[model samples]
Target: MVTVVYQNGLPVISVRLPSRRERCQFTLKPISDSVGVFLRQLQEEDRGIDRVAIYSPDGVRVAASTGIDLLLLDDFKLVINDLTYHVRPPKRDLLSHENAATLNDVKTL
Candidate 1:
């Protein structure tokens, strides 16, 4: 699971584990300030249903599941059976003026 955000003129995509405090659904937990922005973008242009999947960074099936979303933590590496998997770099989209400033304000912690 990855949280994709448009950073300061760049795309800052992250991944992490889901919190156990809430039920599984499309959460604003992945990205704080950018949640609305991303949701708006998704609404404007549908990212596709079930495109987002929630799973452990190591590919373990998580108890919580959302039809089209996933929750993950930052800095969690992807692994499987004690072996790390290869991941291709995602395509970068230069943030627009509107999203640039907003993206820059997101606190990673």
Candidate 2:
């Protein structure tokens, strides 16, 4: 059987064999923090997700399930293992000025 464990803020996959009384562990290195945290949260909460992945607006794969590759068909949709998750990007901060400079700016110093 295989199990996932969290150590040092990262997810580790552990393989266990009861008959052989042996165990081995491997860490998922390629997954990013944001993606890993999201996956782990869903797993812990029993969200009934068999697989998950994320993609950029331009259709670049940001992250994916172990040993799986997926492409986004729509910017607002994510499909993994035949399960579709519809998502919308959060609202941008419209009130912030792009050119605003604080006193900490080098020119101000």
Candidate 3:
């Protein structure tokens, strides 16, 4: 998780997405910014996996109620603690034998 920062216009928020198809591109970002809205940004550059939840190396859901801006911490060149995220299919009535037959499961990246 060692990144040499420069002026590329893309903010530094170093997180990991276990991508399979179109998400083969590596990236990073910083803390103290909008963690939530940043994921919104992720919706654009990155594809296939839509934003469901963001987590830490230690396994914690990073969301707005807890203030995403304050959630990401940068120090000692830690690479912003490394980013990990999750995604699921469209949250609608269309995931079943006909539409959600069993336990409403989720999808991942």
Candidate 4:
């Protein structure tokens, strides 16, 4: 299983072979600061179905999946590498003036 953790605003990756017990881990800071780029590079290296597990800096699991879509199970808790990720609904500015105006317009229509 491949795991990626964001540490100090950088992405650190750990690759563990199911056959072998040892884990090979390294940081992607040298290559890129963007997590998206790191994941893309990993996908290219693996060259197959990419199952990813993501975690926060404090070791909280943010997401885990067998495919690219991480939000497939939206707003759910997942455990990855002994860390728990508490997913919550995304925050939105529903009460913003523009949004409120749009809502009022819709109500009138």
Candidate 5:
């Protein structure tokens, strides 16, 4: 549903984009289709979906089942496991004689 506003036919606009995350309409597989199928298909566009998954509604946190019985649940949550790329500072013994492999990977200090 798109709405066009008019001030005497001249359109006033800024970008109001819809999230692909919120707007997905995926086709369910026949049988043995786990919850992962939706996420796998969707990750073709969004990077986060690979590590992201739907969790059970409350403290009764059930593990991710092989069953895509999501239809039975009243609610599910999207959990983002933010596994950030960690660029870290140096340890004192990093330049020691015993270790040469990690030294080669580091850019020259």
Candidate 6:
């Protein structure tokens, strides 16, 4: 996993290939609320899916089997390994505890 810190719509800190503890400490502005709203809208588009989760900083943990691709919103820039990448809107949905059957069952879209 990578460690990232975003502030004012820019990533100011990042650590690539971070350890688990480092990954846990990485923090970014709380975007959970906004992400939740997006999930709700997505659910309206597809009733089969509703629950979604977003971790702090920037990361998308997904299952191995799912072929779904993730897109980050370009408005929110991402910095990883000292490199900046435009955040494109995510194509797949974030996985949440509510909709996931098991710890590893949920795939990050």
Which candidate achieves the best TM-score against the true structure? 5
TM-score of each: 0.24, 0.35, 0.36, 0.30, 0.39, 0.22
Give RMSD to native, each candidate.
13.1, 13.5, 16.6, 13.6, 22.0, 16.2
Q: For residues 1-109, could you state the per-residue lDDT of candidate 6 as single tens digits?
A: 3333334342222323222233223222222323434334333443433243332234553222321112232233333334444433323233321232234666667
Q: Candidate 2 lDDT, tens digit per residue, 43-102?
A: 544444566555565556665342211111123344444554444422223232223222
Candidate 4 segments whose C-alpha is farther than 4 A from its true place: 1-12, 17-24, 30-32, 51-109
**Candidate 2 stretches greater than 4 Å from native:** 1-33, 64-76, 94-109
Clashing pairs in 4: none
Which should have the higher lDDT, number 4 or number 5? 4
Superposed by TM-score, candidate 4 places the C-alpha of residue 45 at a distance from the truth, in angstroms, of 1.6
lDDT of 1 by residue, 1-109 (tens): 4334534443454433132333222223232334334334333343232233224556654443321122222223333223343333234322223344344556766
Model 3: per-residue Cα lDDT at residue 42: 51
Cα lDDT of model 3 by residue, 13-107, tens digit: 44344353322232323233455555555555546444445555556555544433234332121112234333211222211112212234665
Evaluated at residue 87, the lDDT of candidate 4 is 42
User: On residues 10-76, what C-alpha lDDT tens digit does candidate 5 reach at each position?
Assistant: 2211111223434443444323456566446546646544464555545243344544333222334
lDDT of 4 at 66: 31
Off by over 4 Å in 3: 1-11, 14-32, 65-69, 74-109
Clashes of 4: 0
Per candidate, the number of residue pairs that clash is 5, 0, 10, 0, 0, 10
